[PDB]
Amino acid sequence: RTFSYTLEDHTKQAFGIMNELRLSQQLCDVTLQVKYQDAPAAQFMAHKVVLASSSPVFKAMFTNEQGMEVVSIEGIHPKVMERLIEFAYTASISMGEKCVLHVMNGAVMYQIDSVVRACSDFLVQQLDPSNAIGIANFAEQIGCVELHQRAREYIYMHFGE
Amino acid sequence: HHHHHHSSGGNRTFSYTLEDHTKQAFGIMNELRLSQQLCDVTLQVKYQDAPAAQFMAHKVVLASSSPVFKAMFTNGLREQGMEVVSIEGIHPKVMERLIEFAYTASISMGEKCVLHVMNGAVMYQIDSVVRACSDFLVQQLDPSNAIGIANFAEQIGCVELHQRAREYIYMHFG
Ligand SMILES: *c1nc(S(=O)(=O)c2ccccc2Cl)c(N2CCN(C)C(=O)[C@H]2C)s1
Ligand SMILES: *c1nc(S(=O)(=O)c2ccccc2Cl)c(N2CCN(C)C(=O)[C@H]2C)s1
């Protein structure tokens, strides 16, 4: 008859090693160059296949061919991209409250929907009269319909509307 | 160096983990393997009286599941195209099962295949498969097979299987 084995946390151990390889700059076939405003240029080595596995945008980019590619990024802060890359390689992201808007914007641009959803839910929790308008505005700018609606609903509710 | 161009328009802590992210990601990495997309390695596998086989894969995924593949591919030249690696002394179906494990975390095979796979797993230091195979054979330990299994363990280099088998024999005599 049949011998069948599953290692539950194999994908975690494997991502651990893929992250080690990233930081050692081993087997990296993509370089992300990030330029923001009047800030120093930042460079991030990574593996196309790991990026494609976490982002439909990277998947579309790289499946549409063998050799180092450079992706030049403008108007995104290096620490935003570093946080998204670390998410792709670890499944985790941790940051100050003031970072959430810039990261959610990053996440949207590379369709890391789970991070968009995490950021969105967080801001809906933090809604108050001071921030409601800014958040609503931001939501409209970056195109997050659900965050915009929750924020607009929270504002017009203060006027029995 | 094919270039891409992307342009853009209190004190509480935010932290998020997507529990099954590595599973979803491996799902897509496996999809990409079977569609032969983003693959940078082709394994050519040749063994005894069996037909030549090709397996396309991603060096980084193989290296993440096998220290031998990791050593192989970090010792190879950088900015290489597709690389073709000749492999000998492992049967294509053994390597196919190990690759599928690397990409899915699961392995299934006939009971009679366990020895050839465990041998494969040891050769490429896929230790969790070695451990799985070993524990299975330890379940089969009896007076008839204890010696054969102990011998096998020594042949293929599996320390844990050899010790568990020798420990089972020493229980009768010491
Ligand atoms: C959390 N992240 C940052 S950041 O990554 O340093 C950053 C800098 C500039 C633009 C966007 C981001 Cl996410 C934070 N900040 C760093 C300090 N600072 C001057 C900020 O304005 C603030 C956003 S919060
Ligand atoms: C389970 N798998 C196989 S196999 O994949 O067909 C194979 C062929 C040749 C060498 C190694 C393997 Cl794993 C089995 N076999 C090994 C025993 N045997 C006598 C076979 O011919 C073959 C079916 S068992």
mmCIF file of C-alpha atoms in Angstrom, chain A residues 31-36 39-45 71-73 76-79 81-82:
data_model
loop_
_atom_site.group_PDB
_atom_site.id
_atom_site.type_symbol
_atom_site.label_atom_id
_atom_site.label_comp_id
_atom_site.label_asym_id
_atom_site.label_seq_id
_atom_site.Cartn_x
_atom_site.Cartn_y
_atom_site.Cartn_z
ATOM 1 C CA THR A 31 17.734 44.189 -8.105
ATOM 2 C CA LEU A 32 15.123 46.734 -6.847
ATOM 3 C CA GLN A 33 16.464 50.352 -7.036
ATOM 4 C CA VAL A 34 14.210 52.643 -4.892
ATOM 5 C CA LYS A 35 14.467 56.509 -5.211
ATOM 6 C CA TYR A 36 12.227 58.767 -3.017
ATOM 7 C CA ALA A 39 16.626 60.720 -0.100
ATOM 8 C CA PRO A 40 19.618 58.432 -0.909
ATOM 9 C CA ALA A 41 19.123 55.642 -3.536
ATOM 10 C CA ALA A 42 18.578 52.168 -1.956
ATOM 11 C CA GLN A 43 19.262 48.747 -3.582
ATOM 12 C CA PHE A 44 17.503 45.420 -2.647
ATOM 13 C CA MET A 45 18.624 42.025 -4.096
ATOM 14 C CA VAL A 71 13.326 47.265 -11.313
ATOM 15 C CA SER A 72 13.653 51.072 -10.844
ATOM 16 C CA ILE A 73 11.012 52.402 -8.385
ATOM 17 C CA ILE A 76 8.178 54.995 -2.810
ATOM 18 C CA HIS A 77 10.379 55.198 0.347
ATOM 19 C CA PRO A 78 13.152 52.540 0.578
ATOM 20 C CA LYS A 79 11.845 51.414 4.049
ATOM 21 C CA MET A 81 9.894 48.465 -0.163
ATOM 22 C CA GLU A 82 12.189 46.825 2.462
#
